[PDB]
Amino acid sequence: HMELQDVVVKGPDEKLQLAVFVQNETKPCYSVSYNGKTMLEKSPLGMNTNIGDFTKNLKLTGHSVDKIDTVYQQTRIKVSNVHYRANELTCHLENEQGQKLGVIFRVSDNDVAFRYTLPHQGGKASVTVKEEQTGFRFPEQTTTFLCPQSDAMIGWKRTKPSYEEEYKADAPMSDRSQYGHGYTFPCLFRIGNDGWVLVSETGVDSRYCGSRLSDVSEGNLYTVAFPMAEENNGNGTVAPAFALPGATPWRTITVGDHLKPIVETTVPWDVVSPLYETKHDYRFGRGTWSWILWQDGSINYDDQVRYIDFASAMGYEYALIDNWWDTRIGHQRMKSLVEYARDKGVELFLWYSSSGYWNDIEQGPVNRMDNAIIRKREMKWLQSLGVKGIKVDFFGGDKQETMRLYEDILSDADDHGLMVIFHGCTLPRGWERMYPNYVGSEAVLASENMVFNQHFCDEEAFNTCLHPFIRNTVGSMEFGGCLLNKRLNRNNDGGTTRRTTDVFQLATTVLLQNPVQNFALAPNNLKDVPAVCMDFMKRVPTTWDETRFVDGYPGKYVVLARRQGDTWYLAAVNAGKEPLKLKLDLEMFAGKTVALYKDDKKGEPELTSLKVKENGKVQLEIRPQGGILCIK
Ligand SMILES: [Ca+2]
């Protein structure tokens, strides 16, 4: 009947369609459909800017279309080779004053990435974007899987926000956020029975701020919100500023009738490029990590010797030395520790606080990463020692000032051949491709919380069944998983109690992806953990060539297969309270004999063999809080 769209752009197979409404509309907007079903209703576009307003009553003066068809290679993500095929719509907009603004849509089969461009105009060479009107409006029956943005300057030593909040599964849209500050990316929506939508953003660097979703308004609308003024302890302004001609980051919409495109999406990397070339061949792998289970009491020379030895015995590439080391071990003895590790075929990652001036962190070393002079001095020392990586913690929030800090740290690091892990940090936004030496981020309730609180032990399976669909699907997640201890303290006889099985934990090494994995193993595990588990952990990969979603539902259960070289790893876990019965079609395992890790009826780990017939017909039952792993 009566159609108002100015122009329509489709994905290559034409299932995904995006329509644009600008002409004669008070508020410029777009809408999204998949297989003819409305996935996003009319959602606002535009922005408010210190050279002009692009919020209301725009004209679409013209448009252009192009076909993108390229191949790119990317390490440190869920797949190693991407054939990117999309259709690009460029819209040229004008406000009543005649000021100009571009909007670009790139639509692949199951993803939309869009951004604004601002040309040099009005004698202006720079701009401050006061606000984005950019929005996402959903069908009435839509439910949500969101974690809230916290207040600023709360939590441990006033270090929040730190992207460390809890989810609600299938929540009503009308629900109010826990703190009244909306939700951090990425954000998962179930469109009734018509499939799924994941909202995020990518290509955020020093030229913008990190963004998030507001609370709902009008019953169904989420608006792109800029960081809160109280972040970074009130230092630095909220509104992002950049040179003209310039652009906003990419807003991303992963949409499908199934969970498969959600899990397998590469849109955080589809629309960004490396910001520098590296001369270093960065080696990824596995680390031992004393602090997770042995905590602050482990930060001393002899215990670090113990974990270095443990890494050597495990054949692990790295050992992570955590907070307090500069004061309880010292820079001087660190050299002999590094030498000792090298003689054992082990290299080190060292913990640093990013923090200089915005919080109350005392754990050191502090003030070695915020000042470029001091930072480069430090990194020269690190490189001269042959330290291979750093873990940088406790950042100041989402303000562009903090983005500047992230990027500059990464750049100096690369100049000194150092890999970088971020903790106490924001969500990575396509950062693996943008930064050659980036090797992962926290931005999640990590395994440390299970050590801290029994609640997070009880919730482990639920969150594990969330991450492949949400947090981890858009980027590396340094979770610190695989706890083979039964009791989460040093002597394995106190503290919190793991609620999941060993095979669950093993499966979690495949489910949760990060290039440099610092697992929560401990030396005592070589004595008090069944040999098959430790044997597996000796062969665990941390990098992948391909990832295939097999089955699952967010927060309930998850089944995925990941390939390294010619070897396929299928991992599944169950967060339900009733046993889970799977009939799977596994092309992977053809007519082959696979190695099967399973919970025995008593819940203990068992390794057997399983013949998968030419039909690919596998059948399996998974106990609650349990898992299954197939390798061939
Ligand atoms: Ca943390």
Calculate how far, in angstroms, residue 442's C-alpha sits from the geometric centre of ligand 1: 7
Q: How far is the CA of 475 from the centre of ligand 1 (A)?
A: 17
Q: Single out the residue in 498, 526, 543 at which a domain terminates.
A: 543
Ligand 1 centroid vs 424 CA: distance in angstroms?
5
Ligand 1 centre to CA of 351 (Å) is 12
CB 223 within 8 A of CB 137: no
Question: Distance, CA 477 to ligand 1 centroid (Å)?
Answer: 12
CA of 334 relative to ligand 1 center, distance in Å: 24
* Resolution of the model in angstroms: 2.3
φ, ψ (nearest 5 deg) of residue 64: -140, 155
Q: Are 168 and 210 in contact (CB under 8 A)?
A: no
Ligand 1 midpoint to CA 102 (Å): 39
Contact (Cβ atoms closer than 8 angstroms) between residue 280 and residue 536: no
Query: Any idea what the Cα angle at residue 464 is, between residues 458 and 470, rounded to 5°?
Result: 130
Q: How far is the CA of 397 from the centre of ligand 1 (A)?
A: 13
Q: How many domains does the chain have?
A: 3
Beta strands 516-518 and 546-553 are: unpaired
How open is the CA angle 403-409-412, to the nearest 5 degrees?
140
How far, CA to CA in Å, does 341 sit from each of 132, 217, 232, 323, 515?
50, 56, 37, 19, 21
* Strand, coil or helix: 42: strand
160 C-alpha to ligand 1 centroid (Å) = 10
What is Dmax (Cα atoms) for the chain? 77
CA distance between the termini of the chain? 55
* Cβ within 8 Å of residue 609, ≥6 positions away: 593, 594, 595, 596
DSSP string for 257-273: SSSHHHHH--HHHHT--
Q: Give residue 320 CA to ligand 1 midpoint distance, Å.
A: 15
> What span, in angstroms and rounded, lies between the C-alpha atoms of 255 and 197?
4
CA 444 / ligand 1 centre spacing (Å):
8
Structural domain ending residue among the three candidates 495, 521, 543: 543
Instruction: Tell me how far the alpha carbon of residue 361 lies from the centroid of ligand 1, in angstroms.
Output: 12
- Burial of 584-603, coded b for 16+ CB within 10 Å and e otherwise, reads bebebbeebebebbbbeeee
C-alpha span between 459 and 559 (Å, rounded):
18
Q: Please give the distance, rounded to the nearest whole angstrom, from the Cα atom of residue 123 to the centre of ligand 1.
A: 46
The phi and psi torsions of 18 (rounded to 5 degrees) equal -120, 130
| 464/573 same-domain check | no
Q: Specify whether 182 is located in the same domain as 74.
A: yes
d(CA 112, CA 17): 9
Based on the number of CB atoms within 10 Å of its own CB, is 350 exposed (0-12), middle (13-18) or buried (19 or more)? Answer: buried
For residue 333, report the distance from its CA to the centre of ligand 1, in Å: 27
Q: Cα dihedral angle (364, 431, 314, 544), rounded to 10 degrees? A: 170
CA–CA gap between residue 177 and residue 291 (Å, rounded):
33
Q: Are residues 256 and 397 in the same domain?
A: no
Ligand 1 midpoint to CA 281 (Å): 28
Distance 223 CA to ligand 1 centre (A): 28
| Helix H or strand E encompassing 302 | helix 301-314
Residue type, 435: Y
Dig out the tokens for 449 from the structure.
């919380």
User: By C-alpha distance, which of 339, 342, 338, 343 is closest to 321?
Assistant: 338
Same domain, yes or no: 319 and 232: no
Tokens encoding 84: 């990117």
- Separation of CA 581 and ligand 1 centre (Å): 36
Q: Are strands 143-146 and 135-137 parallel, antiparallel or unpaired?
A: unpaired
Distance from Cα 154 to the centre of ligand 1, integer Å: 13
Q: Is 291 strand, coil or helix?
A: helix
Experimental method: X-ray
Ligand 1 centroid – CA 353 distance (Å) = 11
Q: 180 and 203 share a domain?
A: yes
Token representation of residue 106: 């790139």
Ligand 1: centre distance to CA 382 (Å): 23
Q: Domain containing 503: what range?
A: 273-543
448: which 2 tokens? 């440390």
Alpha carbon of 423 to ligand 1 centroid (Å): 6
Q: Which of 272, 290, 309 is the last residue of a domain?
A: 272
Task: Give 358 Cα–ligand 1 centroid separation in angstroms.
Answer: 16
My answer on whether 65 and 211 are in the same domain is yes
Residue 237 half-sphere exposure toward CB, CA atoms < 13 A: 8
- How many angstroms does the Cα of residue 298 sit away from the middle of ligand 1? 18
CA 212/CA 200 separation, integer angstroms: 8
CB 508 within 8 A of CB 499: no
Same domain membership, residue 279 and residue 262: no
User: Quick one: which of 372, 382, 367, 442 has its CA closest to 407?
Assistant: 372
Q: Are 338 and 387 in contact (CB under 8 A)?
A: yes
Q: How far is the CA of 446 from the centre of ligand 1 (A)?
A: 7
Among 369, 54, 401, smallest CA distance to 207 is for: 401
Three-state SS for 311-345 is HHHHCCCEEEECCCHHHHCCHHHHHHHHHHHHHCC
DSSP 412-432: HHHHTT-EEEE-S-PPPSSHH
Dist. CA 196 → ligand 1 center (Å)? 30
Please give the distance, rounded to the nearest whole angstrom, from the Cα atom of residue 425 to the centre of ligand 1.
Answer: 8
Q: Residue 621: beta bridge partners?
A: 581
Residue owning tokens 């040099």: 120
Under DSSP, is residue 278 helix (H, G, I), strand (E, B) or coil?
coil
- Beta pairing partners, 593: 611
**If you measure from the C-alpha of residue 449 to the centroid of ligand 1, how many angstroms do you get, rounded to a whole number?**
8
If asked whether residues 230 and 305 sit together in one domain, one would say no
d(CA 624, ligand 1 centre) in Å: 28
Say how many Å lie between the CA of residue 512 and the centre of ligand 1: 17
- The residue whose two tokens read 């030396």 is 523
What's the gap in Å between 127 CA and the centre of ligand 1?
A: 35
**Residue type at 103 in one-letter notation:** V
Q: Inter-axis angle of helices 301-314 and 531-539, to 10 degrees?
A: 80
Contact status, residue 553 vs residue 468, Cβ threshold 8 Å: no
Residue 439 CA: distances (Å) to CA of 186, 343, 418, 462, 523: 19, 25, 10, 26, 25
Phi, psi of 214 (to 5 degrees): -70, 175
Q: State the distance from the centre of ligand 1 to the C-alpha of 460, rounded, in angstroms.
A: 16
Please give the distance, rounded to the nearest whole angstrom, from the Cα atom of residue 379 to the centre of ligand 1.
23
Same domain, yes or no: 291 and 143 = no
CB 348 within 8 A of CB 338: yes
Element (H, E) at 400: helix 400-415
Main-chain phi, psi angles of 182, to 5 degrees:
65, -150
Q: Find out whether the peptide bond into 186 is cis, omega within 30 degrees of 0.
A: yes
> Are both 342 and 221 inside the same structural domain?
no
The residues, any chain, with a CB within 8 Å of residue 595's CB and separated by 6 or more, are 607, 609, 610, 630, 631, 632
Compute the distance from residue 421 Cα to the ligand 1 centre, in Å: 12
CA 487 to centroid of ligand 1, rounded, Å: 21
Pair (553, 510) in one structural domain? no
Which residues touch 339 (CB under 8 Å, ≥6 apart)?
none
Distance CA 592, CA 353 (A): 49
Q: Crossing angle for the helix pair 331-343 and 301-314, nearest 10 degrees?
A: 20
248 shares its domain with 291: no
* Distance from the alpha carbon of residue 279 to the mean position of ligand 1, in angstroms: 31
